[PDB]
Design an enzyme around this catalytic site. Structure first.
Site, short mmCIF file in Angstrom:
data_model
loop_
_atom_site.label_atom_id
_atom_site.label_comp_id
_atom_site.label_asym_id
_atom_site.label_seq_id
_atom_site.Cartn_x
_atom_site.Cartn_y
_atom_site.Cartn_z
CB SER A 233 -1.55 14.26 -13.57
OG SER A 233 -1.94 14.07 -14.86
CG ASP B 267 -1.84 1.11 1.31
OD1 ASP B 267 -1.98 1.83 0.31
OD2 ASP B 267 -2.46 1.27 2.36
#
Ligand code: REG
Ligand code: REG
Length: 330
Positions: free
Chosen positions: A199, A35
């Site tokens: 992004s 994770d």
């Protein structure tokens, strides 16, 4: 040193991926969910409330000659899906893929929430976010990666998740055979303890690329791609009959649909998520409504590049003094 382990989807939808981890001496092998959105290595154990265990493999510290109680230490974690776990702590030897860490904090669950009990395939979590998020009190503990770092050939790990197939986690090296083209690296902020990056934009299907900054986290322990509501609406508007359902808890679409791809930017590079990756199948067994793999992040407080996005790329988690993320097509 290096390590290399195969990670396997827990079910036919790629809801999560498990990776075998050796704990203790002699080894006890547990299948953990790696994770990158958390920082605790915790396991089902001989201490877990018996009614909360349903088919998981447990860690039994009393059978390990290398286990030691980390006296006084406790932990308690709550995840963004509302699940939780808590317990006490042992130090033990932990090995992933041939890479061994001695004195790793192994957080033994006394209690787990219903979602963990009901998932017999996941024996615990191995957190790979920054150690500043570790929940052990009163002495915060290091992740497996942070403890391994100084011994590794390169201070990196890579995630290469499969679509309906096994993939690989590598530690300490970048397998140049595992991707196509070049790796594009992007800056990371550790301010919130995550692999947080920005992004450069997105495209829906064959549509034009929208240049826009989207902060978010690279999170192998989240199934779906959670993005701003504007982006998500633009995506689902291209699917006939798709809608946001408050009763189901997100976007659903007709199972008869063909989904468009979704592209996200990494600097000047582009990662393309095929439409089939965005299909999470019927909302209930036999339903003709299907659950979407791109969902709104509104109310979650953070955009999350979960497995739907990460499985479309070879991902480098560069833990050098200045951390960065790298993405390549594959
Ligand atoms: O909790 C999150 N995802 C689900 C958990 C379940 C077990 C492993 O991952 N993601 C959080 C990251 C920051 C916002 C929400
Ligand atoms: O992806 C999430 N959990 C996935 C793990 C836990 C059980 C199945 O696999 N939770 C997300 C919900 C909204 C943000 C976090």
């Amino acid at each position: 040193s290096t390590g290399s382990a195969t990670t396997t989807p827990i079910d036919s939808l790629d809801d999560a991926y498990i990776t075998p981890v050796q704990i203790g001496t002699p080894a006890q092998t547990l299948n953990l969910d790696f994770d990158t959105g958390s920082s605790d290595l915790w396991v089902f154990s001989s201490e877990t409330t018996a009614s909360e265990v349903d088919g998981q493999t447990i860690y039994t510290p009393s059978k390990s000659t290398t286990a030691k109680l980390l006296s006084g230490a406790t932990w308690s974690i709550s995840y963004g899906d509302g699940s939780s776990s808590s317990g006490d702590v042992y130090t033990d030897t932990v090995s992933v893929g041939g890479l061994t860490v001695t004195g790793q904090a192994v957080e033994s669950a006394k209690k787990v929430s219903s979602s963990f009990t009901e998932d017999s395939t996941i024996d615990g979590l191995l957190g790979l976010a920054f150690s500043t998020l570790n929940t052990v009190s009163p002495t915060q503990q290091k992740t497996f990666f942070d403890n391994a770092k100084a011994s590794l050939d390169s201070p990196v790990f890579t995630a290469d998740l499969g679509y309906h197939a096994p993939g690989t986690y590598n530690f300490g090296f970048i397998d140049t055979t595992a991707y196509t083209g070049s790796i594009t690296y992007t800056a990371v902020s550790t301010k919130q303890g995550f692999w947080e990056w920005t992004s450069t934009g997105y495209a829906v299907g064959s549509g034009t690329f929208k240049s826009t900054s989207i902060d978010g986290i690279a999170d192998t322990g989240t199934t779906l791609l959670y993005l701003p509501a504007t982006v998500v609406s633009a995506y689902w508007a291209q699917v006939s009959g798709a809608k946001s359902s408050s009763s189901v808890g997100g976007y659903v679409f007709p199972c008869s649909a063909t989904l468009p791809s979704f592209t996200f930017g990494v600097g000047s590079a582009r990662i393309v998520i095929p439409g089939d990756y965005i299909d999470f199948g019927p909302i209930s067994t036999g339903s003709s409504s299907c659950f979407g793999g791109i969902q709104s992040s509104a109310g979650i407080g953070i955009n999350i590049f979960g497995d739907v996005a990460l499985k479309a790329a070879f991902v480098v988690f560069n833990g050098a003094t200045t951390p960065t993320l790298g993405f390549a097509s594959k």
